[PDB]
């Protein structure tokens, strides 16, 4: 599904490479965890899969159907429903299932207008509410590959636990997912793990291999 071989890239010509000799193969329906220190090149790696970053050396292979969840939540003017469905056609089952999984039902049902409350000249949501709406939008989009760049960053540990278990693991169970996370709790459930440090791959393998210190 997703393959990278001896991949290196630079943001600025004649600068330091943002990613240095990156190698990995993620099979269909697998969960790859991308861990690392701040500025390691994790987002930059996802930017490369999106084509926003061109490799100077190496090769990248994948199927075009990608749904990307940013580290930074973004909300368009309009209703909650308008924000989650976006371009995509509406299916009640898919919609209400995504909301449930992304811990949004309780928040939405607190409003009298429910999903029809205007967002963005309208209500202001919390960081967590915004992050949940952004993740909901990404998981609602039907793609072959899901790039989830630190979605739980502005979420409390209780909500994050519920979302990871019921959305990332249960709802998206059969889809190829790349999750940018540095949590052991998340890493235990990963098929493969990539640890980045200053553009370099410090670890690549299974959880058992990582466990064997």
């Amino acid at each position, epitope marked *: 599904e997703v393959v990278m071989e001896n991949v290196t890239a630079f943001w600025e010509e004649g600068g330091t490479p943002v990613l240095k000799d990156i190698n990995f193969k993620i099979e269909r329906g697998q969960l790859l965890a991308v861990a690392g220190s701040t500025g390691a090149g994790k987002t930059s790696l996802l930017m490369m899969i999106m084509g926003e970053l061109e490799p100077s050396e190496g090769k990248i292979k994948h199927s075009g159907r990608i749904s990307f969840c940013s580290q930074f939540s973004w909300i368009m003017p309009g209703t909650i429903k308008e924000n989650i469905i976006f371009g995509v056609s509406y299916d*009640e*089952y898919r919609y*209400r*299932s995504v*909301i*449930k999984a992304c811990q949004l*039902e309780e928040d*939405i*049902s607190k409003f*009298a*207008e*429910k*999903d*029809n409350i205007v967002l963005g000249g309208g209500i202001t949501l919390s960081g967590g509410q915004r992050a949940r709406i952004s993740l909901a939008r990404a998981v609602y989009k039907d793609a072959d590959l899901y790039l989830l760049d630190s979605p739980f960053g502005y979420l409390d540990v209780l909500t994050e636990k519920e979302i990871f278990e019921s959305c990332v693991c249960k709802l998206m169970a059969n889809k190829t997912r790349i999750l940018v996370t540095s949590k052991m709790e998340h890493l235990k459930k990963a098929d493969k793990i990539l640890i980045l440090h200053e553009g370099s791959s410090y670890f690549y393998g299974t959880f058992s291999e990582l466990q064997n210190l």
Partner: nanobody
Amino acid sequence: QVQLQESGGGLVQAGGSLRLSCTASGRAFSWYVMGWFRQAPGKEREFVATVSGNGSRRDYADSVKGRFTISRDNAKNTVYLQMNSLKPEDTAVYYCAASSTYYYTDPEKYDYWGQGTQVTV
């Protein structure tokens, strides 16, 4: 969030038919999963039939399956229950309820309730 009012109850001979209506007064009717519930004298409130906000999902109690039909009109903020081929077992107070949570048939998940209508068979 929603105020419910049932109508259509009364006395009927066995093998007969009756149609119950329930109008909802409030915002975002389409968000609610509507349900019909019956409470026989001495018994608890039992689930009869449910409709998703869309109307895409309809579920019925095994006892009423093939005889009862649940329908919705979001433009008229109404939910209906067509009760055909009635048996004396169906004698109970029929309640109409709304749930703000997706897909549950347990009356415990329904927050808003109507006054109810007595049906005698």
